[PDB]
Scaffold this motif. Structure first.
Motif, short mmCIF file in Angstrom:
data_model
loop_
_atom_site.label_atom_id
_atom_site.label_comp_id
_atom_site.label_asym_id
_atom_site.label_seq_id
_atom_site.Cartn_x
_atom_site.Cartn_y
_atom_site.Cartn_z
N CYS A 11 3.38 1.61 -11.40
CA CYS A 11 2.12 2.13 -10.89
C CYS A 11 1.57 1.28 -9.75
O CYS A 11 0.82 1.77 -8.89
N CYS A 14 1.23 1.88 -5.72
CA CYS A 14 0.12 2.62 -5.13
C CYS A 14 -1.25 2.16 -5.62
O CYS A 14 -2.25 2.43 -4.92
N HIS A 15 -1.31 1.55 -6.81
CA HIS A 15 -2.56 1.27 -7.47
C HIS A 15 -2.76 -0.24 -7.76
O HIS A 15 -3.46 -0.60 -8.71
N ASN A 27 -9.11 6.17 -6.75
CA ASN A 27 -8.70 4.92 -7.42
C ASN A 27 -8.96 4.77 -8.92
O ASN A 27 -9.43 5.71 -9.58
N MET A 55 0.88 12.41 -6.41
CA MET A 55 1.33 11.53 -7.50
C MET A 55 2.40 12.25 -8.34
O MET A 55 2.17 13.38 -8.79
#
Ligand code: HEC
Ligand code: CL
Ligand code: CL
Ligand code: CL
Ligand code: CL
Ligand code: NA
Ligand code: NA
Ligand code: NA
Length: 82
Positions: A11, A14-15, A27, A55
């Protein structure tokens, strides 16, 4: 612990640190998560399983148990702000 490890491996591209480098307004921090209703393990796990927009779906990539663990990690981090 496993939830954090899964997050790092699947993850964080991207996060990282609860951000979203791809979609600015989606977010993993308190404001956006609360606005969109990602305030339960189940809400988060459903989204991770099926994917949404750009996603990917994780339901064919991570087990149900892994999805639960990472969803709990994200819930706890979001509620306490990363
Ligand atoms: C980039 C290739 C991503 C990876 C890796 C992961 N996510 Fe993601 N996530 C991404 C986008 C582009 C979006 C927005 C989708 C949309 O609605 O158009 C999201 C969103 C989320 C959310 C919702 C956040 C919010 O509404 O404020 C959650 C809870 C989320 N993503 C979780 C998550 C997890 C746990 C991941 C690893 C298994 C993961 N994402 C990977 C882009 C990307
Ligand atoms: Cl996007
Ligand atoms: Cl959403
Ligand atoms: Cl969903
Ligand atoms: Cl997909
Ligand atoms: Na790790
Ligand atoms: Na963008
Ligand atoms: Na698979």
């Amino acid at each position: 612990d496993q939830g954090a490890q899964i997050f790092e491996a699947h993850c964080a591209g991207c996060h990282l640190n609860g951000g979203n480098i791809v979609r600015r307004g989606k977010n993993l921090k308190k404001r956006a998560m609360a606005k969109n209703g990602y305030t339960s393990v189940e809400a988060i796990a459903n989204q991770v399983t099926q994917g949404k927009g750009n996603m990917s779906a994780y339901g064919d990539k991570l087990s149900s148990e892994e999805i639960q663990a990472v969803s709990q990690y994200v819930l706890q981090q979001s509620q306490t702000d990363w």
